[PDB]
Amino acid sequence: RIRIRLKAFDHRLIDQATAEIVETAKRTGAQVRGPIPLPTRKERFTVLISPHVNKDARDQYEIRTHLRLVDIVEPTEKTVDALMRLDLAAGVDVQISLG
């Protein structure tokens, strides 16, 4: 089975990507597993915002890396190849893995 790991910072974008991938899968092949949402990584950062000194002065940023696990149960001839030409939107790191 083809496991697909979508990773992105924007959630909407990721969602869009996932849908597209599903569409790509579903026309060619059959029995797409589904878009399973894994836990989001909220990598936080604190920094001092003064140039020199004021330690209680701080900004707390974060990067929300979202995960989408799409799986394809039956890899056909037509389906797997379809993704080669079918590149997804920018800012979405995909990671296909058969078996």
């Binding site: 597209e20 790509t24 026309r27 379809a82 993704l83 030409r85 079918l86």
Partner: protein, 110 residues
């Protein structure tokens, strides 16, 4: 076909290195194209080819949800083996007839 983007081009009335049809001929032969998308409503294809011989429509590096149903539609006739052509087509979806003059200011997305 709505917008055609050829590399190393200034306007549509120029000419290019290594081809037969001129650029107005290429735009007419691209206006005759027959595409069938499934999921999206606006896609971008890619055509890249070098070498002596005609450029069919079957040489476009397709994505998954686009289907080019005329694999003998000719576009160019590449004559020089050192010549290349890399155009990026944009395929919308609508109805009726919307021409270039009205679509000269209608287009909002700068």
């Amino acid at each position: 076909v709505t917008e055609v983007e050829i590399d190393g081009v200034l306007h549509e009335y120029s000419t290019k290195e290594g081809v037969q049809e001129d650029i107005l001929e290429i735009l007419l032969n691209l206006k005759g194209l027959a595409v069938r998308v499934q999921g999206k409503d606006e896609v971008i294809l890619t055509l890249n080819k070098s070498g002596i011989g005609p450029v069919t429509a079957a040489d476009i590096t397709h994505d998954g949800d686009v289907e080019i149903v005329k694999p003998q539609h000719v576009i160019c006739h590449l004559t020089d083996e050192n010549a290349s052509i890399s155009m990026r087509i944009k395929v919308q979806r609508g109805r009726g007839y919307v021409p270039a003059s009205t679509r000269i200011h209608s287009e909002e997305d700068e």
